[PDB]
Structure 1
Amino acid sequence: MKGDKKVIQHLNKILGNELIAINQYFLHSRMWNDWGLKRLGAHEYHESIDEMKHADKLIERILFLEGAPNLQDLGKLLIGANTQEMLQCDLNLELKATKDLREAIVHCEQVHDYVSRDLLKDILESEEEHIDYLETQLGLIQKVGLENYLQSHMHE
Structure 2
Amino acid sequence: GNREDRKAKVIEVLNKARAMELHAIHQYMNQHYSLDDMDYGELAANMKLIAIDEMRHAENFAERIKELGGEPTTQKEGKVVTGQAVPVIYESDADQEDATIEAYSQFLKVCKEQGDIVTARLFERIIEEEQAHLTYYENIGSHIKNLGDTYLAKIAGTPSSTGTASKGFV
> What TM-score comes out, normalization by structure 2 length?
0.85
Q: For 1:116, what is the secondary structure of its paired residue?
A: helix
Q: What is the aligned counterpart of 1:135 among 126, 134, 138?
A: 138
5+ long unaligned stretches in structure 2? 160-170
Contact 1:105–1:117 (CA<8 Å) still a contact in 2?
A: yes
Q: What is the aligned counterpart of 1:84 among 84, 87, 92?
A: 87
Q: What is the aligned counterpart of 1:151 among 143, 150, 153?
A: 153
Alignment of 1:96-115 (within 5 A): 96-115=99-118
Highest Rg: 1 or 2?
A: 2
Question: What are the superposed Cα offsets for residues 35-92 of structure 1, whole Å, 9 maximum, x if unpaired?
Answer: 1111110010101111001111010000110111111344222345211001112112
- Work out the percentage of aligned pairs sharing the same amino acid: 30
5+ long unaligned stretches in structure 1? none
Q: Report the counterpart of residue 94 of structure 1 in structure 2.
A: 97
Whole-Å separation in 2 of the counterparts to 1:96 and 1:77: 16
Whole-Å separation in 2 of the counterparts to 1:79 and 1:126: 25
Q: Report the counterpart of residue 37 of structure 1 in structure 2.
A: 40
Q: For 1:70, what is the secondary structure of its paired residue?
A: coil
The residue identity in structure 2 corresponding to 1:26 is M
TM-superposed deviation, 1:142: 3.3
- Runs (4+) of structure 1 moved beyond 6 Å? none
Whole-Å separation in 2 of the counterparts to 1:89 and 1:78: 10
Q: For 1:66, what is the secondary structure of its paired residue?
A: coil
The residue identity in structure 2 corresponding to 1:91 is A
The residue identity in structure 1 corresponding to 2:30 is L
Q: Report the counterpart of residue 18 of structure 2 in structure 1.
A: 15
> What TM-score comes out, normalization by structure 1 length?
0.92
Q: For 1:34, what is the secondary structure of its paired residue?
A: helix
Contact 2:14–2:65 (CA<8 Å) still a contact in 1?
A: yes
Contact 2:28–2:47 (CA<8 Å) still a contact in 1?
A: yes
The residue identity in structure 1 corresponding to 2:115 is H
